[PDB]
Design a protein around this ligand. Structure first.
Ligand SMILES: C[C@@H]1O[C@@H](O)[C@@H](O)[C@H](O)[C@@H]1O
Ligand SMILES: C[C@@H]1O[C@@H](O)[C@@H](O)[C@H](O)[C@@H]1O
Lengths: 297, 297
């Protein structure tokens, strides 16, 4: 069981922060504030951080129970965890596992329960996106049911998203203008100053794009790497795994990079935002210390 | 290189025919006809069958280019494959990789382009679901764009589904009842007479549930097993892998089953629809011939 990464090209993998195929691979050295994503977080030893779900397909999924019958297009849900246990809002988690970890003007959804007139679409407005409190108020809900006390399961499908930069802004999970009562995974910061976070990007469907249509949400690890770490017994024999990104078809080595053991990748010598080809495969080379300096891209 | 399966519980894995977590594990010996699913199909040696996408997150996604500007809530797309190449209708494929492989009244979707005024919702009516012909007519499309010539990407999110048995009926991909020119993965049939297909089930969101409200779509392999077969170079050393399904928490061996090398699981001795616990893990035991007789559940 020596360390390895799966043999998948970047374009054959999926985002761990929005369910969709990876579409871009890039480093942007001019980002002013480090991201503090709560999904897509996993150590190389397979320990999940933040709200990262153990089951890949619980990302952007939710379940709960109606607290009241639908009225005036409002559906209020008391939230459960994926495993159907009750989400305890006095415990300090920001949200059930897999809930969105960024700021949006609304989160559009679909949901359904065990009876027929409970399939509907709706949305959570930003001011209602307070899942740390243990429930969510869904508005613009367009089904006639459920009545009270009914299990509902659903999916967040798209967002109203005026600024692309808000994908890196944590939401006000407890509605309290941000508290240090929540258990949040720490910011993602390269351990050497010339290093830049390598971002795995995908395109979510969003509205509110009228004047700026490009939307890109980034993550630290492909979902398939998170599952790889969960299904292997890896021991980090070093601070960081030195990787090479290779076009396996043409043989061309594109760059070397460091996969830090807390679960993110960096490159060295990036002076402007730089995109990389998507048809490459990251291959493990060897274990290196944190102070190891990479060949510049 | 020795055959294995990932150490995930069934409820920690995902459907390969509808993007959602697995919710049921069951065998039904009284299903009228054998399924001929085109997604979720992969041999143990990692050969994808049917329309099964290589990238997990391509399932239920589509990409194409608008044929004309939106008018009267109609958007017609000429279809592409996931890799952005043009889908070739002469090739014999029934649809681009990842397209739905079952009959429904409507396929509800959301889509968006790189430019403003292109985020919308819509649906493909059954009579318009003829992707083998190389395009799809989306109706009830609610955005003002796109114009002609614009690349659109989207996701099928729910279906109108009056009859649950239609999940096991292939759609009329080319607009007719005649599928002889189409390269279809074969029907899934156990090789020994008392065997029953073991179905991995999830709940899709559907409308039209007034007759029968329970909706369950089944698949032959969890998506994480398909990716496992792609990322390992297994050789099939016998006709079937004998597996044991074990509750790893308690230790109770629940049943043994056969994973045939063409990519599906059977159990023996099921005489009525039988559901099984979701908290177990499948473990490889040994390679066995087609006629190896399992201990009955
Ligand atoms: C109810 C509103 O409807 C449209 O304006 C969408 O663009 C917004 O995201 C919001 O959902
Ligand atoms: C146009 C129709 O609208 C509603 O009746 C849905 O329940 C149907 O599935 C279809 O989408």
């Amino acid at each position: 069981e020596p360390f390895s990464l799966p043999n998948l090209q970047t374009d054959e993998m999926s985002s761990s922060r929005w369910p969709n195929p990876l579409a871009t691979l890039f480093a942007d050295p001019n980002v002013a504030v480090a991201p503090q994503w709560q999904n897509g977080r996993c150590t190389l030893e397979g320990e999940l951080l933040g709200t990262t779900p153990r089951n890949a397909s619980w990302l952007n999924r939710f379940r709960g129970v109606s607290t009241a019958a639908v009225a005036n297009q409002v559906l209020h849900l008391t939230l459960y965890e994926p495993d159907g246990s009750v989400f305890n809002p006095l415990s300090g988690a920001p949200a059930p596992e897999g809930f969105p970890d960024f700021t949006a003007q609304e989160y559009h959804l679909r949901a359904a329960g065990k009876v027929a007139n409970t399939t509907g679409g709706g949305e959570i407005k930003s001011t209602d996106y307070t899942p740390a409190l243990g429930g969510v108020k869904i508005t613009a809900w367009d089904a006639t049911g459920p009545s009270a006390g009914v299990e509902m399961t659903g999916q967040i499908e798209s967002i109203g998203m005026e600024n692309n930069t808000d994908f890196d802004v944590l939401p006000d999970y407890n509605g309290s203008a941000f508290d240090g009562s929540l258990n949040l995974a720490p910011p993602i910061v390269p351990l050497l100053p010339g290093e830049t976070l390598l971002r795995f990007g995908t395109v979510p469907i969003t509205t509110r794009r009228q004047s700026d249509p490009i939307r890109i949400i980034s993550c630290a690890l492909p979902q398939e790497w998170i599952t790889w770490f969960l299904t292997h017994n890896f021991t980090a024999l070093g601070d960081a795994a030195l990787l090479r990104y290779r076009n396996q078809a043409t043989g061309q080595l594109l760059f070397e990079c460091k996969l830090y053991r807390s679960g993110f990748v960096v490159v060295n010598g990036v002076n402007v935002r730089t995109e990389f080809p998507m048809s490459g495969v990251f291959e493990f080379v060897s274990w290196v210390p944190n102070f190891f300096q990479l060949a510049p891209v």
